[PDB]
Every structure is written in C-alpha cells, then in structure tokens.
Amino acid sequence: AAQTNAPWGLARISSTSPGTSTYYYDESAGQGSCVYVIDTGIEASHPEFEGRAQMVKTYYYSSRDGNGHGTHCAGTVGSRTYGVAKKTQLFGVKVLDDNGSGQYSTIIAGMDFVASDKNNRNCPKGVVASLSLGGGYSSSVNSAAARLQSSGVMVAVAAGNNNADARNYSPASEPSVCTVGASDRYDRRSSFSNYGSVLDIFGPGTDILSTWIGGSTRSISGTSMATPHVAGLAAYLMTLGKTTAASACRYIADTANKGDLSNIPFGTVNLLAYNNYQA
Ligand SMILES: O=[Se](=O)([O-])[O-]
Ligand SMILES: [Ca+2]
Numbered sequence: 001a002a003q004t005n006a007p008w009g010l011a012r013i014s015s016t017s018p019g020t021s022t023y024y025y026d027e028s029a030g031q032g033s034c035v036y037v038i039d040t041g042i043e044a045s046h047p048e049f050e051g052r053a054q055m056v057k058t059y060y061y062s063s064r065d066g067n068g069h070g071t072h073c074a075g076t077v078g079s080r081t082y083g084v085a086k087k088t089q090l091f092g093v094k095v096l097d098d099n100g101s102g103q104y105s106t107i108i109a110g111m112d113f114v115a116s117d118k119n120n121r122n123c124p125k126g127v128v129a130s131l132s133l134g135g136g137y138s139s140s141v142n143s144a145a146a147r148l149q150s151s152g153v154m155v156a157v158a159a160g161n162n163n164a165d166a167r168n169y170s171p172a173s174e175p176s177v178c179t180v181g182a183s184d185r186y187d188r189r190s191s192f193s194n195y196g197s198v199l200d201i202f203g204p205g206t207d208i209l210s211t212w213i214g215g216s217t218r219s220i221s222g223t224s225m226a227t228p229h230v231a232g233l234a235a236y237l238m239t240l241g242k243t244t245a246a247s248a249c250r251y252i253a254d255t256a257n258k259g260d261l262s263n264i265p266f267g268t269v270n271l272l273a274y275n276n277y278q279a
C-alpha cells in the first residue's frame, strides 16, 4: 500500500533514503495487534482513530486528554493519516496529568496495569506499549518497565530530550526495553535527542505531524514523537508474523537502516527504524 504526501517520518520508515514523501506498507497494517499509549490520554473521538482507540485507565479525575501529547503520540502509532500501524487497536492509559506531569508511583502502576490488562483484550498478533515519558534515574521505574516487557509486551520508551547520555534517565536506561532516540528529516540526530550505549534505535522525532485534541493536528518535536514510530512499527511487524514482543526491538535493530544518521556520538548505535517493506 502507498500513502502519498505522508508525513516525512512515515515516508522515512519505509525508505532506504531521506527526502521522499510516500509511505509504503503492507495492507495488514497492524490489524489484530494492540498498542497501549501510556501518556496524557487519547482523544478517542478524533476522526483519525476511526473507532480503534479507547481509554482503558486513568489515575485522575478524567480519562480525557486535556493536554494533547498523548493524542499526538497515539496518532503516530495508529491514526489513519499520521500513523505507522493504521489498523491497530489503541488503548490509552492516562498516567500523566493535563500538564504532562506524573508521579513515578503512578507511572509504575500504569505499567503494571498494562501487563495485566492485556489479558482482558483481544490482541492475537501481540501487544506493544509506548512510553513517551521519563525523568531522572529510578531503579523502580526501570524495574516496572522490565516487568512489562517480561510479561510479553513490546515496550518502547523515549530516550529523553536532554542531549545527554540516556543512562541517567528512566525508563530510558532500562536495558531490556526498546530505547528510542530521535532524528530529523535530513537524517541528523535531533538536536535534543539523548544518546548513549543504552539506545536501541532511532526514529523520526523532529517536526512530526500528528493528531491533537479538539479534533485537530499539529507538528511537534521530541523523543516522544520517535517512540510511537517504533511502537507502531513493532505492532506492524508482529501482525506480519516477522517477530514477537520479546524479539521485536532486536529485529528492528537488525533490519534498520545502518550508518545513515549524522551527529551520532561515538558508542551510540547508528540505526534508523525501517520496515523493509517490498511490494
Ligand atoms: O514534511 Se512534513 O509536511 O513536515 O511531514
Ligand atoms: Ca470522563
């Protein structure tokens, strides 16, 4: 399948070269998979989600996304226009308040929640969790992410936006999950992207168009935007039967575009998420 005039990041994930604008992907499109977006919520009523999104948990007075961040990330996972995996099921877990903030205790509970809640959902092709969030190093937060992964969920987490080594941030620094850095449309490391040995992969993260609250769209930047590209890619590849939740991060690294990013510090992987889709 071909989506013309796609957001650059979608075109990038199905290309061996920067500078194209069509996204190519197998029409299965992540059908039968599920992606949990653990964030500020998801505006499930957005036409872009086509009834495939729903809120399943909140720790606050509403399950509504009063911020936009979670809706944007969910859009990059699975919206019809802005998403990687255009037929996946999206589940929102609101661990961040409408200011985009959340206590680590709440974030941990949300991860635990997903590990169990997947047993209440129909996801025959597998389960992914996307965590576009983080803060300073916490062994408890890392352990929660490790448990979620161990439970059979492909966990993708943002590296962080500190232009620093991700070793000092969580859940970025948990080795067993998929830690995602950000690139731009010219295949440069995004100016803000964290780096380091713990990164597994880069995805598009600068100037990413997606859904926003109030039935709208906007372009924003962050490792938060790169992460859902990788989460959606995992769901897509799992639906194709090419990999599993336990092995998807490694598979994505194996099959990535290699050596094509600039300003990658010595000792950080030079790997850009790629679907290797061949019609
Ligand atoms: O190229 Se675009 O319109 O910023 O995705
Ligand atoms: Ca409500």
Ligand SMILES: [Ca+2]
Binding pocket: 164, 165
């Ligand atoms: Ca450093």
Ligand SMILES: [Ca+2]
Binding pocket: 174, 175, 176, 177, 178, 179, 198, 199, 200, 249
């Ligand atoms: Ca890892």
Ligand SMILES: [Ca+2]
Binding pocket: none
């Ligand atoms: Ca290893």
